Structure 1
Amino acid sequence: LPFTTGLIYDSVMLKHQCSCGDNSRHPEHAGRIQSIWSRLQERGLRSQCECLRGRKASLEELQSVHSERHVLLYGTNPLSVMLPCGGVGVDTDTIWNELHSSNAARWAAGSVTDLAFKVASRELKNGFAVVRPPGHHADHSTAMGFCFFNSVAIACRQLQQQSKASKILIVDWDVHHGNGTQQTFYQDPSVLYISLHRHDDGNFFPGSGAVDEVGAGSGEGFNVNVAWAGGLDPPMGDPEYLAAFRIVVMPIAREFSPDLVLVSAGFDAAEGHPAPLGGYHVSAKCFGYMTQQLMNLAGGAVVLALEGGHDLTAICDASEACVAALLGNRVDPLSEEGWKQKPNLNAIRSLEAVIRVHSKYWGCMQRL
């Protein structure tokens, strides 16, 4: 296998859809990964990468993060809740195809894991997983927010249990808080979880991920929530996220010094997502640049896994810029006006809260 960027995609994951067939009512649709996959070929990036199909996660791999009851319910064939539209699901948003959802969720978990091992073993330089359904909301014993199994958390656990990576950084720049990922690794100091999300004092899904939530026991200080407050006005975009990377994400990541970086790469903070889905204005160039910054860690061992993002144009633009970054294309910070603007007052106050809390744990957060 050649030493380039890896891409994960398979049609099995397209099968996850409600029986009613309305992709408008169920916005986490197959078109999401389908559009990105073809977009990468149209732009010429896909042929440059080593394209893999992935695999099903074993029941044992799913149980490394989730409970036995959870894995029996969503992981196995029955032969071994009603919705307004008529289909079955765990809740109104999180649908369940009785023939295909389990297989698609297990494939997303297995494929992110398979890609992480190849990047960890250094067969691949880095990778991008075009997977669905998403994972970072799925906790130990709860499927929620379009998520069933936490693919990124499962990939992380398997890397540790097979001794392929000592320290692992999980970065989650999806606009929503990865409640599942935070819970899984809350007491583990060998995993560092840094989330950037719209918090607005608990009035935004899932409602968790406050700045005070720093971890527990041995894992105290190794959970970093960059919880944005203040609202949508003034606009949250590139200057705020760039500032977040300069001041919080990269300094803590460098002080932690991971052996492998996993990215819950949601693109619902991008332009084209109105409230209450996101309401943020992060450009595609910023996503690709944030990717480029993470490639400086762990000797380039970086793996992105798709999470959220609805607007087809926005997530395709952003996915393109991240894959290009992975392939070695560099973004010149001086080439874009607007990046010269300072971050807004709401973002500064939010980062002030992050610094004040984590000054107890990190040297780069300790000031006079």
Structure 2
Amino acid sequence: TLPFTTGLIYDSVMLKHQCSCGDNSRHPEHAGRIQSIWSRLQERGLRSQCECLRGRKASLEELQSVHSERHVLLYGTNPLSRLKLDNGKLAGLLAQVMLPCGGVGVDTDTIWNELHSSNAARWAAGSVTDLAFKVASRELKNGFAVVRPPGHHADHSTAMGFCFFNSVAIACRQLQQQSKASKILIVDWDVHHGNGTQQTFYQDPSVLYISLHRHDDGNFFPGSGAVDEVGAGSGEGFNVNVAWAGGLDPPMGDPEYLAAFRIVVMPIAREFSPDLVLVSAGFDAAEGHPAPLGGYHVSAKCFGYMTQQLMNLAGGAVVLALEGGHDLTAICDASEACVAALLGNRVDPLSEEGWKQKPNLNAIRSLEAVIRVHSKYWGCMQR
């Protein structure tokens, strides 16, 4: 197996996105997330195995492949850039939130550093885009983007849920611009639904979006992504919401996620037959996250095994991008497990006794609804 065919993407640029209040306590999407992962990668000796990349900033045009021109100018530029903008744009920017902590924000959760946040978000997006292009051209086999802020909640003209630009959706669009007719699968295992991603590709049959998320009948952030949302127009059938219902008791964990993969993720993905796979790889379904931030128990090995299964797709062209997840030990274990798998380490499903347990009933039920709905569109889902 070829050396240096797995890319890692990281840069200290992305650390500077911090509220001016200097308190990681009230801001869970903090710089420590990526830095703790980065060093773990070095320590366990994986970094040296990978083509390491710095990333770069997304251009305003790359941004506009997903987001509106006004969103891009709001979050993609600074006062007062050396940017050549016409006075009409400059004036629009003159026409236009205080946080409890005294920092500036877009909303309560979503903080804005007036010096650094625009650079860090553009850098997250450009880095996933670049790590991906390498895989698409096939100079690399797969890879992992250690990026923040996250992306999957940002829609055409909305920043929310810690996110400003949808780095994954942007990479997806860029890829497709450069290889005509290519088919892209986005798998989003962050515990939250990637509303911006679903919306971006909702009427687009060239992209298959599969989200697994805690849903609980419309009652978990962001409240979107019910099982019956299958896509529209041309793209009807190409949006798959594995919407987990029923809450926190019983325990949602490895047997459920493994079962989701066996029954839904993998068979639909093989039927679709993607040219490349992007992963919105949040780790907030990991053990370590309290009720309001997750409440699930997926383990690092399971994230590892899920990565390994997706490598059987697309000739192996797999790109992960960090989304959510804030327990440092939990996200470091998960990331390690994922990077090992990317390199071609194999997880032994027999090694775990807890993986002999049947999925819980809320899980089986949730999957029944996915199968019921998607039978109309997918052969593997039929009868």
Instruction: Give the shorter-chain TM-score range.
Output: over 0.9
Deviation, 1:68, is 0.7
RMSD: 1.0
Contact 1:120 1:165 in 2 (8 A): no
Deviation, 1:95, is 0.2
1:173 aligns to 2:173 (yes or no): no
Deviation, 1:84, is 0.6
Unaligned runs of 5+ in 1: none
Deviation, 1:82, is 0.7
Q: Could you tell me how far apart the structure 2 residues matched to 1:273 and 1:164 are? A: 41
Per the alignment, in what secondary structure is the counterpart of residue 49 of structure 2?
coil
Q: Could you tell me how far apart the structure 2 residues matched to 1:347 and 1:77 are? A: 46
Q: Could you tell me how far apart the structure 2 residues matched to 1:37 and 1:319 are? A: 9
Contact 2:181 2:206 in 1 (8 A): no
Contact 1:179 1:209 in 2 (8 A): yes
Deviation, 1:185, is 0.3
Deviation, 1:162, is 1.6
Q: Could you tell me how far apart the structure 2 residues matched to 1:321 and 1:4 are? A: 17
Per the alignment, in what secondary structure is the counterpart of residue 315 of structure 1?
helix
Deviation, 1:3, is 4.5
Per the alignment, in what secondary structure is the counterpart of residue 355 of structure 2?
coil
Cα-to-partner distance string for 1:107-161 (whole Å, 9 max, x where unaligned) = 0000000000001111011000000000000000000000000000000000111
Deviation, 1:53, is 0.1
Percent identity over paired residues = 100
Contact 2:4 2:50 in 1 (8 A): no
1:84 aligns to 2:85 (yes or no): no
Per the alignment, in what secondary structure is the counterpart of residue 136 of structure 1?
coil
Q: Could you tell me how far apart the structure 2 residues matched to 1:331 and 1:2 are? A: 20
Contact 1:106 1:149 in 2 (8 A): yes
Could you tell me which of 297, 304, 308 is aligned with 1:281?
297
Q: Could you tell me how far apart the structure 1 residues matched to 2:126 and 2:78 are? A: 17
Deviation, 1:165, is 6.6
Per the alignment, in what secondary structure is the counterpart of residue 105 of structure 2?
coil
Deviation, 1:52, is 0.2
Per the alignment, in what secondary structure is the counterpart of residue 186 of structure 2?
strand
Contact 1:165 1:259 in 2 (8 A): no
Deviation, 1:163, is 1.6
Cα-to-partner distance string for 1:3-45 (whole Å, 9 max, x where unaligned) = 5210000000000000001011111110000000000111111
Contact 1:120 1:164 in 2 (8 A): no
Per the alignment, in what secondary structure is the counterpart of residue 39 of structure 2?
helix
CA distance change for structure 1 residues 164 and 217 in 2, over 3 Å: closer, same or farther? closer
**TM-score when normalising by structure 2:** 0.95
Deviation, 1:183, is 0.3
Once superposed, which parts of structure 1, at least 4 consecutive aligned residues long, lie more than 4 Å away?
none
Contact 1:3 1:123 in 2 (8 A): no
Deviation, 1:78, is 2.4
Per the alignment, in what secondary structure is the counterpart of residue 241 of structure 2?
strand
Q: Could you tell me how far apart the structure 2 residues matched to 1:283 and 1:164 are? A: 38
Q: Could you tell me how far apart the structure 1 residues matched to 2:168 and 2:303 are? A: 18
Q: Could you tell me how far apart the structure 1 residues matched to 2:111 and 2:374 are? A: 38
Aligned residues: 367
Contact 1:2 1:123 in 2 (8 A): no
Q: Could you tell me how far apart the structure 1 residues matched to 2:128 and 2:185 are? A: 15
Per the alignment, in what secondary structure is the counterpart of residue 202 of structure 1?
coil
1:322 aligns to 2:338 (yes or no): yes
Per the alignment, in what secondary structure is the counterpart of residue 251 of structure 2?
coil
1:43 aligns to 2:59 (yes or no): no
Q: Could you tell me how far apart the structure 2 residues matched to 1:72 and 1:357 are? A: 40
Q: Could you tell me how far apart the structure 2 residues matched to 1:134 and 1:336 are? A: 31
Q: Could you tell me how far apart the structure 1 residues matched to 2:378 and 2:48 are? A: 42
Q: Could you tell me how far apart the structure 2 residues matched to 1:308 and 1:251 are? A: 26
Deviation, 1:174, is 0.2
Q: Could you tell me how far apart the structure 2 residues matched to 1:18 and 1:266 are? A: 21
Contact 2:3 2:49 in 1 (8 A): no
**TM-score when normalising by structure 1:** 0.99
Q: Could you tell me how far apart the structure 1 residues matched to 2:180 and 2:151 are? A: 22
